[PDB]
Write a protein that binds this DNA or RNA. Structure first.
Ligand SMILES: [Mg+2]
Ligand SMILES: [Mg+2]
Ligand SMILES: [Mg+2]
Ligand SMILES: [Mg+2]
Ligand SMILES: [Mg+2]
Ligand SMILES: [Mg+2]
Ligand SMILES: [Mg+2]
Ligand SMILES: [Mg+2]
Ligand SMILES: [Mg+2]
Ligand SMILES: [Mg+2]
Ligand SMILES: [Mg+2]
Ligand SMILES: [Mg+2]
Ligand SMILES: [Mg+2]
Ligand SMILES: [Mg+2]
Ligand SMILES: [Mg+2]
Ligand SMILES: [Mg+2]
Ligand SMILES: [Mg+2]
Ligand SMILES: [Mg+2]
Ligand SMILES: [Mg+2]
Ligand SMILES: [Mg+2]
Lengths: 81, 151, 111, 99, 98, 217, 141, 106, 37
RNA sequence: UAGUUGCCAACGUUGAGUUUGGAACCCUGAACAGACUGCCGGUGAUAAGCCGGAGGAAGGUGAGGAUGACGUCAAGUCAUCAUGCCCCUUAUGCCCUGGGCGACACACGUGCUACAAUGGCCGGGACAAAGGGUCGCGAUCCCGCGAGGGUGAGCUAACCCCAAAAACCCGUCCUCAGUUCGGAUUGCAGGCUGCAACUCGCCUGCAUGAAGCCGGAAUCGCUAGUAAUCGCCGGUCAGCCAUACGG
């Protein structure tokens, strides 16, 4: 609490840029360690795993957590298959 | 070893009773390298034996070693023939330490509140014929007389 | 039901007998006595007014009920939202950076 | 221990000293100002310098071989090559040990 | 009251220089408290022999630092000229004032 | 099957360090950098000034001796006159060669080149005299035999020579050595000099380990 | 306490009878003196400093148990390092050394009983590749 | 029977037809003294031909630990993979029979 | 024992600090124990 | 022999800092001596040596270590480095972001913590060594239950700090119970390092309290301050997955 959460500038600008318009402008990102401020609520964001970007819709119960928790990059279904 | 000449260790005695038998009895109690705790196990026991028997605990301890000491054992050999177990005698020093292992061994196994109580009831019972260590003497002594013939 | 909808033994001390309650650990058991500044006597020998004074103060914390519900909803929060940590609960696997190659017999056994 | 990596580290050495003093000013600026009041700006332009100028991103290598492991800050060389220098009479006071 | 500390790695080298501090100062009228050797430090270092798995094979080495302490009293102009004029060996690192 | 380097085995009593200086542990590493930058540029200097002969192309030993505001360097050779006396500015250009990387006006340095008593008594030039023949592929045993016959003039008591690698161009390497006199490695009291040298052949590379027993002491 | 400082005017340095023993990284600066048969360590009682361990009280006394002088002298000592066993048994040598200066005639009972023999055995060093000085690690063949 | 098995692709991949050939051979040599051993170690290797310089050669290293302080070390080399497995199995059956002859010496 | 981090035996093994293994006397021992007559 | 940054004593503001006397104690580091079957007995081929007194701190190699012959395994490393030949030069090279090296039915090993009463929790009191440290180690004091956050005395270190050594002694309680044994797993709330802590760091405060009652066939270490057992330090290091490694 002594410091603010981590939110990159390249992401913060794009999020703040769209609040003026208030419309879907589906966007790609790369920083998985970014915290979800409630200003990016109702938007849809694509998070870069090892391979590609994963568009995910933002829910009100995602605020305190970061983006990377929802973007898996291990890709394991079953064993010996 | 292959030398056959093992040095004779300096058998020490305790401060109070000033006998070497007691110090040999203590060295088998500890297992983590601490001696101050064994006397709290011992000095509470011999005091407890005196509390029950109304006599010196030294004679009761000297009698227990005198009764449990088998002075004979059986060892396996196959230098001639297969699966032979003929008897073999025991010296004075060997039989002395050999009885301490059986007493403290049975004391740890039997139930009780603490090692001082487990040790007290062992020596008092062992001196009076009936003792778990005395049973092992009978079992070991049985195998000797059973295989009395050298075969 | 001695206190808090649980039958506690009557032979143990007070400090090390409230701990059987699902919401009372080792520190909370001491904080209650220290707030009431009473002596840690036996469980059965305790007076009625003093034991009454415990029954009113223990209910202030998340003792039982809402405690187990406050947790289960929290684990349910991660499952429906599909966090990384939420999927591992569904898989019956840990979520705090453990290695899963040769350990974790607790959760693998608790399938 | 490729040649490009050794020059790649020299790149980070120069960028650090280039952007050294302003970071101390920013580490003191971020410690004084109240949260949610210019703090995102302070931490904001804390990201704008090159990440290659960070001290934590450094990695000590051997002065000769450029090896990324077994380094010693008192010597600056890797353990293997440093061993040979002890034997062939180049280091003062570095004698074999037995205690 | 000029307290001088000097440190070095070599025993026959530092003893020679310590003799020169006395020789340069004994000619001048000034008393000297004798040299008091402080406890010597020893920087142990461990390294592997091979560049491969051979772990039990290790090579320890040390760097022994022999330090000495000498102090003068009642300094003079003739004294200070005698100390600076004196030449030292290579392996000595004098510390003239603390 | 690995023998310790005898130099490291006798640093305490018999053998001395060829770099006499001192600094704090924080600056101990920087001093070694200054030493190597000196020791390396001498080789780059002597290599280029000389026509790459089988003689005085290399040197014997370098000794650095530092002091506050002085760095006393002492190069050791068997025949300094081949590449020092021929050029009067050659000895001077060496100082400019070092002074660029050394420091500004402060911390100057003087350097001397002392003649060793026996130019072949040491193993340094004795290895290079051999290596000059292996590059010209004179023969294997002749260079090993001629070296032993040469050091008798240098009044040596014992010597041992070892060569490893590819010799006859075969697809397999070999290790051949020879000993003369007495060369006790396990005797700390004795004085033994040691040197290792590499020879870049058109195929592969060779290695030359030499031991020279000079005095029981 | 002020009591020990009253008997010693300048400390254990400016005294005649002295004993200096050492065992297992411990030091014992012993000073004998005519007294009433007491035994104090570092301005603190023996049983308070030794925690009532009977043997550690024995070792400091067996130099004095011989010759029947357990009542004539009062023994004041010091300690620098090591544990209570080393400090106690180092004092056993120190108390022995000081009795020699009282009279060199009775050196033999102290020697024949084996008290002046400084037990020079020290904790062994840990070797590389081993868990202890001799404990080798386990490995499956 | 009731004995485990360990293969190892040292320098190549372990196929299925090969694995069937392994179990067939040591299954014969070990089935005799099956009540003395618990496991079977195997390590296949390949060298030469197109992989490395020199003649193509395939090694088969086989170690065996019995139930009573028994150790066996077997290593052979052949031009083919199956031929290497065959020769080693003959060596195990030779030494494995040597043990019983010593235990049953009476 | 040593695995129980919340005890002084565990803090010493893990080299951490808290109510169990304090740094000095003035640190927090928030819950004390009651007397026993 | 030398006497401080250490040792002995006097003084007390005080035990954070000072002053005075002593070199007689102890330690620190130079230089020497001391241990060689040297002396006596027995035995011995009139030998080597062997068994024993004595003396001495130590006696038969005083204890420990470095130390590793000719050679063996075409043993190991081309990824410390250096290297012959071969191979890729709009890629087998060059720079960055993110991910991965931390995934997981299982199997094979090395270790850690335990199954408790020779024990466990709390309170009080004691006793070490070797190391590390000026962009550093950080005292005292003030905040927070706490991790930590402010002030920054001293210490280039025989001065100061890291730094509380723990086992152990005294006293209260727990009385053989999956327990006041055991501390895995998970949630919540916080702190520090750092541009960055989701995958993937270390810690605090609480609450949860798995398996496990000394362990098959088999199998390892250790012959003295050893094994067993207790804790401390360091290196790499912003930080640390270190229960490791070296002391
Ligand atoms: Mg509870
Ligand atoms: Mg780093
Ligand atoms: Mg050889
Ligand atoms: Mg030591
Ligand atoms: Mg290991
Ligand atoms: Mg191994
Ligand atoms: Mg517990
Ligand atoms: Mg930890
Ligand atoms: Mg507080
Ligand atoms: Mg090979
Ligand atoms: Mg290989
Ligand atoms: Mg290479
Ligand atoms: Mg290459
Ligand atoms: Mg590639
Ligand atoms: Mg790995
Ligand atoms: Mg992973
Ligand atoms: Mg169970
Ligand atoms: Mg039980
Ligand atoms: Mg087990
Ligand atoms: Mg042995």
């Amino acid at each position: 609490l002594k410091k603010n959460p981590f939110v990159a500038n390249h992401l913060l600008r794009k999020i703040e840029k769209l609040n003026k318009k208030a419309e879907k402008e589906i966007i790609v990102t790369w920083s998985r360690a970014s915290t979800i401020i409630p200003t990016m609520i109702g938007h849809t964001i694509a998070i870069h795993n090892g391979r590609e970007h994963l568009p995910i819709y933002i829910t009100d119960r995602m605020v305190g957590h970061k983006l990377g928790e929802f973007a898996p990059t291990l890709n394991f279904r079953g064993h010996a298959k | 070893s292959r030398r056959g000449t093992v040095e004779e260790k300096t058998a020490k005695s305790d401060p109070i009773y000033r006998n070497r038998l007691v110090n040999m009895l203590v060295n088998r109690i500890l297992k983590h390298g601490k001696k101050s705790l064994a006397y709290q196990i011992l000095y509470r026991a011999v005091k407890k034996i005196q509390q029950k028997t109304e006599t010196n605990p030294l004679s009761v301890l000297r009698q227990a070693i005198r009764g449990v000491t088998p002075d004979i054992a059986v060892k396996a050999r196959r230098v001639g023939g297969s699966t032979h177990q003929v008897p073999i005698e025991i010296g004075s020093t060997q039989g002395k330490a050999l009885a301490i292992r059986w007493l403290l061994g049975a004391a740890r196994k039997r139930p009780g509140r603490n090692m001082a109580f487990k040790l007290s009831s062992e020596l008092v019972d062992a001196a009076k014929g009936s003792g778990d260590a005395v049973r092992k003497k009978e079992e070991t002594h049985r195998m000797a007389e059973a295989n009395r013939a050298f075969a | 039901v001695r206190v808090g909808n649980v039958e506690i033994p009557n032979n143990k001390r007070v400090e090390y007998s409230l701990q059987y309650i699902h919401g009372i650990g080792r520190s909370r058991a001491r904080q209650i006595l220290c707030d009431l500044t009473l002596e840690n006597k036996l469980t059965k020998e305790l007076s009625e007014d003093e034991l009454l004074q415990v029954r009113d103060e223990v209910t202030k914390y998340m003792i039982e009920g809402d405690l187990r519900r406050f947790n289960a909803i929290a684990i349910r929060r991660l499952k429906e939202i599909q966090c990384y940590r939420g999927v591992r609960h569904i898989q019956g696997l840990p979520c705090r950076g453990q290695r899963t190659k040769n350990n974790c017999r607790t959760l693998k056994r608790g399938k | 221990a490729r040649k490009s990596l050794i020059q790649r580290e020299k790149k980070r050495r120069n960028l650090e000293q280039k952007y050294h003093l302003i970071r101390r000013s920013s580490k003191q600026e971020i410690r004084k100002v109240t949260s949610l009041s210019d703090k995102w700006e302070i931490h904001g332009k804390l990201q704008s310098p090159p990440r290659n100028s960070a001290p934590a991103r450094l990695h000590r290598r051997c002065f000769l071989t450029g090896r990324p492991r077994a380094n010693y800050r008192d010597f600056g060389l890797s353990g293997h090559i440093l061993r040979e220098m002890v034997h062939t009479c180049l280091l003062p006071g570095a004698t074999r040990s037995s205690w | 009251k000029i307290r001088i500390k000097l440190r070095s790695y070599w025993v026959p080298l530092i003893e020679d220089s310590c003799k020169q501090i006395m020789d340069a100062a004994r000619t001048t009228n000034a008393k000297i408290m004798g040299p008091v050797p402080l406890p010597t430090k020893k920087r142990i270092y461990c390294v592997l022999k091979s560049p491969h798995v051979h772990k039990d094979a290790r090579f320890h080495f040390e760097i022994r630092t022999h330090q000495r302490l000498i102090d003068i009293l009642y300094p003079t102009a003739q004294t200070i000229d005698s100390l600076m004029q004196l030449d030292l060996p290579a392996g000595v690192d004098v510390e003239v004032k603390l | 099957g690995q023998k310790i380097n005898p130099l490291g085995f006798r640093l305490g009593t018999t053998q001395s360090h060829y770099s006499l200086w001192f600094s704090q542990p924080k600056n101990y590493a920087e001093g070694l950098q200054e030493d190597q930058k000196i020791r390396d540029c001498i080789k780059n200097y002597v290599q280029k000034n000389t026509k790459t002969s089988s003689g005085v192309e290399g040197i014997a030993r370098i000794e650095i001796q530092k002091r506050i505001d002085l760095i006393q360097v002492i190069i050791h050779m068997g025949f300094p006159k081949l590449l020092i006396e021929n050029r009067p500015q050659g000895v001077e250009d060496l100082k400019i060669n070092v002074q660029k990387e050394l420091n500004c006006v402060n911390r100057k340095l003087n350097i001397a080149i002392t003649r060793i008593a026996k130019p072949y008594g040491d193993p340094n030039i004795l290895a290079e005299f051999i290596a000059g023949q292996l590059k010209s592929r004179v023969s294997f045993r002749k260079a090993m035999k001629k070296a032993i016959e040469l050091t008798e003039q240098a009044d040596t008591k014992g010597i041992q020579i070892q060569i490893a690698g590819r010799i006859d161009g075969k697809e397999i390497a070999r290790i051949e050595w020879i000993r003369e006199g007495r060369v006790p490695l396990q005797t700390i009291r004795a004085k033994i000099d040691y040197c290792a040298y590499t020879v870049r052949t058109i195929y592969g590379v060779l290695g030359i380990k030499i031991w020279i027993f000079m005095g029981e002491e | 306490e002020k009591f020990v400082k009253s008997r010693l005017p300048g400390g254990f340095a400016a005294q005649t009878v002295i004993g200096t023993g050492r065992r297992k990284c411990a030091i014992a600066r012993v000073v004998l003196q005519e007294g009433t048969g007491k035994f104090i360590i570092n301005y603190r009682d023996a049983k308070e400093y030794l925690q009532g361990n009977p043997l550690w009280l024995q070792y400091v006394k067996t130099p004095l148990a011989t010759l029947g002088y357990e009542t004539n002298y009062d023994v004041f000592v010091k300690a620098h390092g090591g544990g209570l066993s080393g400090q106690a048994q180092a004092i056993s040598l120190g108390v022995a050394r000081a009795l020699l200066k009282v009279s060199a005639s009775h050196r033999a009972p102290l020697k024949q009983e084996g008290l002046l023999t400084r037990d020079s055995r020290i904790v062994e060093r840990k070797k590389p590749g081993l868990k202890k000085a001799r404990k080798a690690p386990q490995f499956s063949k | 029977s009731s004995v485990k098995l360990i293969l190892q692709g040292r320098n190549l991949e372990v196929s299925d037809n090969v694995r069937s050939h392994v179990e067939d051979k040591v299954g014969k040599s070990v089935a005799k003294h099956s009540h003395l051993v618990r496991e079977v170690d195997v390590r296949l290797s390949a060298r030469g031909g197109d992989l490395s310089k020199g003649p193509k050669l395939r090694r088969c290293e086989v170690t065996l630990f019995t139930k009573r302080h028994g150790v066996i070390r077997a290593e052979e080399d052949a031009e083919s993979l199956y031929s290497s497995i065959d020769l080693v199995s003959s060596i195990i059956q030779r030494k494995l029979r040597k043990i019983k002859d010593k235990v049953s010496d009476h | 024992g040593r695995g129980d981090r919340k005890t002084a035996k565990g803090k010493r093994f893990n080299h951490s600090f808290g109510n169990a293994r304090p740094k000095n006397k003035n640190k927090g021992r928030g819950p004390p124990k009651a007397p026993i007559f």
